[PDB]
């Protein structure tokens, strides 16, 4: 029983096949109160909760190297999204959980990693994608991957509408294998939650 239940605000998620959580680059957050915000930043806890996003269909035909990515933050239709439209500057980290649920009779292996400052990777570079915070998902072992990362970047605060620091990436390491008893394919979903949300610079009304 590798039973883990994560909580973010009024939302919870529990897995019975976890392999732990991978913390990336740091285990804490840098100082969220720097000179660049004067004293005007504030924390908006109502945004620290899970939202969902479909990633892709893990099918037998997708080979090693097949890669799907999701640049964060992404389109949000909740309070987080409203924040992005109401404040000039924000910062937050991410608590990511990804599911690739098929069954024990499937085979293959996915690599899920959080990458800072994305750039399309050369196929040779894919062999070294493990230098980034990551975790694997292999049907014989687990159905969930969980990574937690801090905010980072050259600016203590950002303008998400112009730059996306983190970008989630899931890639086929070994192709999915199916048998008569396995799931025919595996839909991969993401359950993400922003952490330590801070905003600064109240923008005007659009009216």
């Amino acid at each position: 029983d590798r039973l883990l239940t994560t909580r973010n605000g009024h939302t919870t998620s529990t897995t019975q096949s976890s392999v732990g959580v991978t913390y990336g680059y740091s285990t804490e957050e840098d100082h969220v109160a720097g000179p660049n915000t004067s004293g005007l930043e504030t924390r908006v806890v109502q945004a620290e909760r899970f939202f969902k996003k479909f990633l892709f269909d893990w099918t037998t035909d997708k080979p090693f190297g097949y890669l799907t990515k999701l640049e964060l933050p992404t389109d949000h239709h909740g309070v987080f999204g409203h924040l992005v439209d109401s404040y000039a500057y924000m910062r937050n980290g991410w608590d990511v959980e990804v599911s690739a649920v098929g069954n024990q009779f499937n085979g293959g292996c996915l690599l899920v990693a959080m990458v800072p400052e994305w750039k399309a990777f050369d196929t040779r570079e894919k062999y070294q994608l493990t230098l980034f915070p990551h975790q694997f998902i292999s049907p014989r072992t687990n159905m969930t991957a969980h990574i937690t990362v801090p905010y980072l970047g050259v600016n203590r605060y950002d303008q998400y509408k112009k730059h996306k620091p983190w970008t989630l990436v899931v890639m086929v390491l070994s192709p999915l294998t199916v048998s008569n008893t396995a799931a025919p394919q595996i839909k991969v979903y993401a359950n993400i939650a922003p952490t330590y949300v801070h905003v600064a610079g109240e923008l005007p009304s659009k009216e």
């Binding site: 039973l3 939302t11 939202f51 969902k52 239709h77 098929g102 024990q104």
Partner: protein, 110 residues
């Protein structure tokens, strides 16, 4: 109730009143108080529906003029499943630690 090789991930959400119709999508419901859980060694998963209303109490009955349910809805979604077709999810209900009923009434037709 599924087989050892049937796997799934579910989500339950409490949609408070104020919206016109319950969302048919986990993505939309995600913004509400909700919980997700997957299939595994443990078959049961329990969730508490919170009491959130303007008044301190609520009617156990529903008036005929009541269009949308006064206390909201509960939506159960299925995020995904692997070979779980035709498998079942038994759902039951029980009183919580602070559940309370007041004002006895004899309303049935006799």
């Amino acid at each position: 109730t599924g087989s050892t090789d049937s796997k799934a991930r579910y989500m339950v959400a409490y949609i408070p009143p104020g919206v016109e119709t319950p969302p048919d999508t986990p993505e939309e419901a995600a913004h509400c108080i909700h919980a997700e859980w997957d299939t595994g060694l443990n078959s049961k998963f329990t969730f508490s529906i919170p009491y959130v209303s303007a008044a301190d109490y609520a009617y156990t009955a529903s008036d005929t003029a009541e269009t949308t349910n006064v206390q909201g809805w509960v939506c159960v979604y299925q995020i995904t499943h692997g070979k779980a077709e035709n498998d079942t999810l038994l759902v039951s209900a029980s009183a919580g630690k602070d559940f309370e009923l007041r004002l006895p009434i004899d309303p049935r037709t006799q």
